[PDB]
Structures are given as structure tokens and as C-alpha cells.
Copies of this chain bind each other. A is one copy, B any other.
Amino acid sequence: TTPDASIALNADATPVADVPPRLFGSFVEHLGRCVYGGIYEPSHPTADENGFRQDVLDLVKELGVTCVRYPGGNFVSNYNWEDGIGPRENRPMRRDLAWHCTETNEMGIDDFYRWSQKAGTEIMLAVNMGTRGLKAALDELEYVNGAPGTAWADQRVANGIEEPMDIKMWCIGNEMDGPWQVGHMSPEEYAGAVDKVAHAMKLAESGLELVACGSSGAYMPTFGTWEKTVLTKAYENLDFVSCHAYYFDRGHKTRAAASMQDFLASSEDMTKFIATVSDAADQAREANNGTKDIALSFDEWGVWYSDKWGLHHEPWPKSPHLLEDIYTAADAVVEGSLMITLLKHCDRVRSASRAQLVNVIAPIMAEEHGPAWRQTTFYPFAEAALHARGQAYAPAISSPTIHTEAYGDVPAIDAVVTWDEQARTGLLLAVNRDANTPHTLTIDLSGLPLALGKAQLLHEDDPYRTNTAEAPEAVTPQPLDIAMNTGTCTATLPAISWISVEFH
């Protein structure tokens, strides 16, 4: 079986950057059953004293998530943060216009902090810029982070949390560009609004890391021009611009081969997407004569099948089944390739949020009063979150090219190498994006300043096979058949495959 592809590290290889732990973040929203029926369900036997599903907490810890975006999302644009603080019996029942739901407010910032303490995760808190603004954000900042003595911080102490929450990263609103967003703004309206909010919050606390919300996606007419205006205006007090990208097989219902191969090449779309958002952030620095680069926050990424999209007297539903996609092995392979692209570009991308954490387009599914189980997309993320440490390296890759209808000629193999020169352990993530042809792969890790370890392979001959509640282990990573020959080792990666290989 002659090798036709090679992953090598040139001698004198300069790292892309240090791996930020924030690259392994996620995002929970008060949407569908992400919170209610997801992280919180008191009736469930696994639930703890606060009502958090322990089986989910186990899988989140296993998933390796470091930081979670909360509480939205479209939800936050008509949300009052005070409705989710204090004793639960005194919290008001409210509406959510975003998703046409009744909100019990059983979960709020109080309880999500308590959840985040158990989970061992940072909170990336989002403020309402739809129906509220500057005053409410400063109020929440004081309540959340304030030393005892001020009236807002004393409320927190009284609420059961004495210590500051230490929320360092903040989202100034949700995506305000979309017509669907409550309180949607023009490019200039949002520019001046983050200008006010960013300046104020930095004045109260200079140690904050602030995110201006970019476009809803690359599909927006204002895309590019949105980022430029906002970042140019508020450059001084910002640290992050957010960018969002979702991917799916367009011909999944017909199981078309062409659309499948397009979908497998989604990384080259993301690479191009990162470059242009980075470019917009560069133009804003240039116009300000600044020294610092505005980092990127990929706070919405993953696979989402979006092709599924008085006069009313009825009460609005509670905890509906929304955006609960079931993922294929193919889906997991592209999410494997997406994380590869994120790591290869972690010099600019310093944060990423896999949207979402539970139930809603998620790597974790929690059934309505049933068991919690790992989706296929769980496994590549979990491997990277646990073992992608130290410095990221963009490896020299010689690969045969596959033709795609959407993106043209694209390399069949793409990869990223991780190295921790004090452990002294490493990691290699690679994908075969070829839909028909397998490829034998050689690896030469010489340039690092080697011994094989646990090697995984995620592949199904039927790429449309999924995990279910009945069969939660129908597709799991299988032991990779790899032979070392000294220095260079070889492995055969089948059509539509993700592998991981740990080394020391």
C-alpha cells in the first residue's frame, strides 16, 4: 500500500501561535431545550441539589469545554438580567420573543455561575443591546464582579454568592445586523452603541475582554462593511470581533454525492472567511494608527441543517424541541476539519464557541427525561480540547487534490500538529476529505524542538450513519492501524475520515 500523501514538519518550523484554551468554548442559549431539558431538569433522576443534570455535567467535563457563552443569542435581545437573579420563587414568568416561548427564569446568571463552578468553565456573558443598553450592562457588571459594599454587589452576596463571579469576557449584545433581531440596528447605530458600552465597561474595569458582535454570517449584505465601521469606531476599548459560520450538506435529503463533497470541503470556506474578517479588523487598526490586533472570536461554529428553517390567545410553549439535529459521521468529519482550521489560525482566532452545547445543534443530546448521550461530533472536539496544548503548527502537506463544485480544487488531506515542549507531548489531527478515494499517509515529525501513543480513527463506510438514543455507540472512534518505520510512521485513512494521533 504505497503512500500518496505526506504530513511533515520542515526543519526550522515556526509555530502559528500558542493554543488558547478559549478555542474550546461552547455556547448555551435560552433556546429550545438547551437549558430546560438540557443543563437543567429537576425532575430527572441525575439532577443535583440545584437541578442540574449530572450526566450532562459529566459529558461536558469529558468534552473538555473551557468557556461558555451565555445567555444568548437572539434570546438576550429582549432579556432582563434581573429576572434571573435571587430566589426562584420570587422570579417573574416572562416571554421570549426570539423563540416564541414562556420563560420561567428558573435559570439565570446566579444559577449559571453555580453551574459553571461545578463544570469548571469560564462564563462569556452577553448583555442586552436590543431592548436595553448602557445602564443595564453597567448594572450587571457591578452585580456580577463588584466588591461587597456597593448596592448591586450586596444583592449578589444576599443571593448566595459572596465572591465576585470574575466574568472577564463580555459580548456587547447579540448579532444586531439581522432583520429578525429584536431592536436590530444599522451598521452605524451599532457602531456608536458599542462605542458607548465598550468605553464605559473598560473605565469601570480595564481587565475586561470585550467582544463587538460582527455579522450574523457571510451571507449578510452588510458583511465586511459592518465589521469595519464598528471596529474603526470603538477600536480602543475592544479586544474581539465575533464571526459566525454554519455548514451543512445541501443535498442531504436526496443524498447527493456532489453536495456531500462540497460539504466535506467546508474548511476552505472557513479559511477564506477568517482571512476577510481578519482583514476588516486590520483596516480598523490601520485607520486608528494602533498597535494591537483585534482578535477574532468564532462564537458560533459547527454543523446546522438550516433548510428546516390580538388573534392568538394560547399561552406560549415551554421547552419546545428546537434545532435538535442528529449528526452523521460525515458531519463529525467536517467538524474535525473545522477545528483543524481553527488551530491552524489560532494566531488570529483566540476564541471559538461550538454552538450549541446541549440538545440545540449540539455534540451532547439529552432526551426528554431520558439518558444523555454523545453525538458523533462529540469525539473530534473532545480529543482536541483535551490534547491540543502548547503551540500549534501548520504542517507541510503534500496531498492529491479533489475537485469540488462549490470551492474548486481542494487538498484531500488537511492537518494540524500540536506540540507541548515541556510535557513533552504532542498531537496530530488530520482529515481525509476525499469522498471516494482512501489515501495512505506518512508522518515526519522531525522539526520539533518520537514515540507513538493512542491513535483514533472516526469512519463509517456509510457516511450517513448516526448515533441515536437507542444506539449511542453505533459510530465511535476506532483504534487506528498505524505502523512506525526510524522517524516516519504510516497510516491508511479511508474515504471521509478523521484521525487523531497522540505522541511523545
* Interface mask (A130-174 → B, CB under 8 Å = 1, otherwise 0): 111011001000100111111110100000000111111000000
- Tell whether A314 is near chain B: CB-to-CB under 8 Å: yes
Chain B neighbourhood of A183, CB < 8 A: 134, 196, 200
- Given A182-B199, A203-B97, A314-B147 contact (CB < 8 Å): yes
- Across the interface, do B154 and A93 meet the contact criterion of CB distance under 8 Å? yes
* Interface mask (A94-137 → B, CB under 8 Å = 1, otherwise 0): 11011010100000000000000000000000000011101100
Copies in the complex: 3
A97 to B195, CA, bound (A): 16
Pick the interface stretch among A255-263, A305-313, A442-450.
A305-313
A183 to B316, CA, bound (A): 34
Chain B neighbourhood of A95, CB < 8 A: 138, 142, 146, 150, 152, 204
State how many angstroms separate the Cβ of A420 from the closest Cβ of chain B: 24
Chain B neighbourhood of A92, CB < 8 A: 150-151
- Tell whether A221 is near chain B: CB-to-CB under 8 Å: no
* Interface mask (A177-190 → B, CB under 8 Å = 1, otherwise 0): 00110111110010
- Tell whether A78 is near chain B: CB-to-CB under 8 Å: yes
- Tell whether A479 is near chain B: CB-to-CB under 8 Å: no
Residue in B closest to A166 when the chains form the complex, CB atoms: B310
A78 to B142, CA, bound (A): 13
- Across the interface, do B97 and A151 meet the contact criterion of CB distance under 8 Å? no
* A contact residues, total (Cβ < 8 Å): 58
Near B by CB (< 8 A), chain A positions 183-225 give: 183-186, 189, 192, 195-196, 199-200, 203-208
Chain B neighbourhood of A132, CB < 8 A: 135
- Across the interface, do B312 and A102 meet the contact criterion of CB distance under 8 Å? no
Residue in B closest to A311 when the chains form the complex, CB atoms: B207
Classify the interface of chain A: helix, strand, loop or mixed. Answer: loop
- Tell whether A315 is near chain B: CB-to-CB under 8 Å: yes
- Across the interface, do A182 and B205 meet the contact criterion of CB distance under 8 Å? no
- Across the interface, do B138 and A316 meet the contact criterion of CB distance under 8 Å? no
- Across the interface, do B206 and A148 meet the contact criterion of CB distance under 8 Å? no
- Across the interface, do B97 and A138 meet the contact criterion of CB distance under 8 Å? yes
A83 to B131, CA, bound (A): 21
State how many angstroms separate the Cβ of A86 from the closest Cβ of chain B: 14
- Tell whether A236 is near chain B: CB-to-CB under 8 Å: yes
A98 to B146, CA, bound (A): 16
- Across the interface, do B146 and A313 meet the contact criterion of CB distance under 8 Å? yes
State how many angstroms separate the Cβ of A129 from the closest Cβ of chain B: 11
State how many angstroms separate the Cβ of A35 from the closest Cβ of chain B: 18
Chain B neighbourhood of A314, CB < 8 A: 147
State how many angstroms separate the Cβ of A176 from the closest Cβ of chain B: 10
Can you list 12 A-B contacts with CB-CB less than 8 angstroms, sorted by A residue number? A94-B151, A95-B142, A95-B146, A102-B149, A130-B200, A131-B200, A145-B310, A168-B310, A179-B236, A183-B200, A184-B195, A208-B310
Residue positions of A touching B, CB distance < 8 A = 78, 92-95, 97-98, 100, 102, 130-132, 134-135, 138, 142, 145-152, 154, 163-168, 179-180, 182-186, 189, 192, 195-196, 199-200, 203-208, 236, 310-316
Closest 7 CB pairs of A and B: A207-B311, A92-B151, A147-B315, A131-B135, A145-B310, A166-B310, A147-B313
Instruction: With A92-B151, A97-B138, A166-B311 given, name 20 new contacts (CB 8 A).
Output: A78-B138, A93-B149, A93-B150, A94-B151, A95-B146, A97-B200, A102-B150, A131-B134, A134-B183, A147-B314, A150-B315, A164-B310, A164-B312, A165-B310, A167-B310, A168-B311, A189-B192, A205-B311, A207-B311, A208-B310
